Amino acid sequence: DVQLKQSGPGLVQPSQSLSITCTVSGFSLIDYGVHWVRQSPGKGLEWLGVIWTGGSTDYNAAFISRLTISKDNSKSQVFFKMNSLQANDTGIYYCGRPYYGNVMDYWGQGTSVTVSSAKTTAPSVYPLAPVCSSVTLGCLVKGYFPEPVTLTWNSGSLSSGVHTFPAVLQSDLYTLSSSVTVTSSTWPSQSITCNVAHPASSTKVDKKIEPR
């Protein structure tokens, strides 16, 4: 019905600028304004600005020198741009529709922004087979940057027994793991494969879990 769809995750280098697009469905920008809010580790949710139906904007006074919101009614798009980003601008930037005033009734999915000079790095993808009732297999996605990676098992057909763990950051590289647990009789008889994509590096790999 009502949807706000934000552009995908972004890496910006310190002192460069961030640009996010919000494309709305189920309503027009003629009829509703759009607010922008972000959530950081260091400050929780912070309201940033709003663009009203008639095109005017109001901004959080802490960001007015750095932030511009604009729109195109005919395209149902709202554009957020913020300059001179620093590390602590890292966070999740949301757009949301005010139904009226400051009641934001529908939200974008959020845009995760990392502000960093670290270099884009493809991951190594390692199959984790058991040591030689249930069996658990794993996949280690090691040494990538930036977020995110996507991981599936048997191209997404294996889901109920899966745990994928939030990435952990150390020395400017991320590591992620995932486990899948099946009844012991179905593997290695039936094949199980880890599918890993790291878009920022154009990496796409499958690792079949092979018995030791």
Binding site: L45, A61, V103, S124, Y126, P127, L128, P130, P166, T175
Partner: protein
Amino acid sequence: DIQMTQTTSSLSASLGDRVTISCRASQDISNYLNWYQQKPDGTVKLLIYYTSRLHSGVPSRFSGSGSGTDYSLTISNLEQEDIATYFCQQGNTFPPTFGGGTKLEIKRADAAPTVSIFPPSSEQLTSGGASVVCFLNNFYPKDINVKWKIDGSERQNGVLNSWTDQDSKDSTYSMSSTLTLTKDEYERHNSYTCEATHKTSTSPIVKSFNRN
């Protein structure tokens, strides 16, 4: 800026419990207080607006009350889908401001972790690296302590830990712990032990392999 203070940072409540989450504004905000629900995947929904008005499609188990500076969201009977972080927002004075959020987890009966340990893959070893991975899956409560022993000696160095958020179906947690070594260091020791303490075990839960 009006400061919004949520009295409680995190709550644990059982299925069917009446649960309440509260907010205090630094100044009278004249019932312009809304409540949002954020899921771990980043989804944000409006629940309650203007203190007590239910957003369309929100289950009637959600209600709100308050006036002046003091406001509360109540869930009449906690359901599985209610695992989320709950944020208040005042919209009475510019700029809109948010509370720090109240995380809500479901309290449930003990669940012992299912622990699996994984030696380095042959791929990573032929690259000079050696990550040992331990998954501790579907346990409750969330407090679990993992220690790595190499030939009996704890190894604090080079460990990365990652917890999932609370499972949306069975209210458990899972955790992945990775010990990363050089290949030469990994080949210089024999016994590798992922040791975990948890509410469900008297002594440590040990998963071990001998580098064969």
